[model samples]
Target chain A: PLKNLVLDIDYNDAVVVIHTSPGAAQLIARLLDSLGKAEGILGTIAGDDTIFTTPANGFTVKDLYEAILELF
Target chain B: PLKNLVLDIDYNDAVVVIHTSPGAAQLIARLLDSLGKAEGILGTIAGDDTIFTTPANGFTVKDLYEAILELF
Candidate 1:
């Protein structure tokens, strides 16, 4: 769990580099849109303690997280 | 440019990891919500030659590429 994460995408070759923490990874996998919006889960950098990404938009990470958390 | 990029997110000293390529960029950005689905482009480790990510559940990386590609 360190900072300075990176995602290297090689267009010609085809590869993805991701530097993230376990929590973030879990959040990503959990937040995956099983429905239809686009394709995969995308992340955005907010502040120091926030790593936000959405399926399409309209909701912030906090919004999505809270909504999903409520499901249980 | 060259791929092998990385995205590091620091939260409580924890970092998020994302390994990707260049061709995967547009597909990601396009999927982003202002639209809402969940979050940003979430990618999955496909085959050796493919790394797929999406906002929600739509099509494959190929499909995403096609939709946004033609827009240009």
Candidate 2:
């Protein structure tokens, strides 16, 4: 496994669930592909220039944190 | 292409929606910048701590899976 993850965040109230958008998902996938950490994303929602991926087996918030570390 | 791409996501009801915060957007943009995701994230909307981005050209779900794989 490479250093990567599935990032999901939302307002505690569940009013807003931030699923990584498609574009963002693509960007992350590209990184993993380069590192040989993935084959391809299974499914997702592309909207507002981002992606909200379908739930899967190995998704975590840590990836969001790590990935965001690079973004900010 | 470099495999990197923009991402987007949305909900069905307007009453509830989630845009990656400005902080999250910044984090993602900063990441691509470091990896040379082809220049900075052209545009963004910085919210309280995250951001809402516009749609882009190159985007997909494959990467979404790769990214989440590590998180879960």
Candidate 3:
């Protein structure tokens, strides 16, 4: 069985920072990026345990948060 | 300017492992996953600095290697 992954969102510099389990960060980043423009995700950059997400124009971090909620 | 990124491919367990800069691993994984089935990529799982890439049927690690070469 796979371990459960968690997420926390922080907003800064017009981007949303997504916090995750260190080991799951990259996978989470991949999942978010896969959502693409259709989901209003402009881009994502992930480190060991953090992902910086940029939303498309007209979208807000709150929108991103809600969009991501569907995955949980 | 962004830091230059590097890639090294290692084959094992019938999958290709992509080694990347620790900070760039997820970004690289996202890039590769975005290629999708059109590029013969079945899936990708990224850790802090390594990505495990599976190819679609009829694809080889060598094919994946060559396909990735275009990004260099």
Q: A-chain TM-score per prediction?
A: 0.26, 0.26, 0.77
Reference-based lDDT, residue A66, model 3: 69
10 residues in a row with least lDDT, candidate 2 chain A: A9-18
Encode model 2's per-residue lDDT on B1-72: one tens digit a residue. 211222444422111122343335455543332321122122233334343332212322233222222221
Which tens-of-lDDT digit does each residue in B1-72 have in candidate 3?
012444576674478777875445665665676678778788888767777887777778778766666744
lDDT of 1 by residue, A31-72 (tens): 332322223223332223222333223443444443433421
- In candidate 3, stretches whose alpha carbon ends up further than 4 angstroms from where it belongs are A1-72, B1-3
Number of the top-ranking candidate, with lDDT as the measure: 3
Writing each residue's lDDT as its tens digit, candidate 3 over A11-64 gives 765787777754457656666766887887888887777778877877787787
The residue-by-residue lDDT of candidate 1 on B12-34, one tens digit each, is 11112232353444343333323
Q: What is candidate 3's TM-score for chain A?
A: 0.77
For every candidate, C-alpha RMSD to the true structure in Å: 15.1, 15.9, 12.8
Indicate the docking level reached by candidate 2. Answer: incorrect
Best by DockQ: 3
Whole-model lDDT, model 3: 0.68
Q: Which candidate model has the greater lDDT, 1 or 3?
A: 3
What number of backbone clashes does candidate 1 have, counting pairs of residues 3 or more apart or in separate chains?
63
Candidate 3, backbone clash total? 0
Q: How badly does each model clash, as a count of residue pairs? A: 63, 44, 0
In TM-score terms, candidate 3 sits at: 0.48
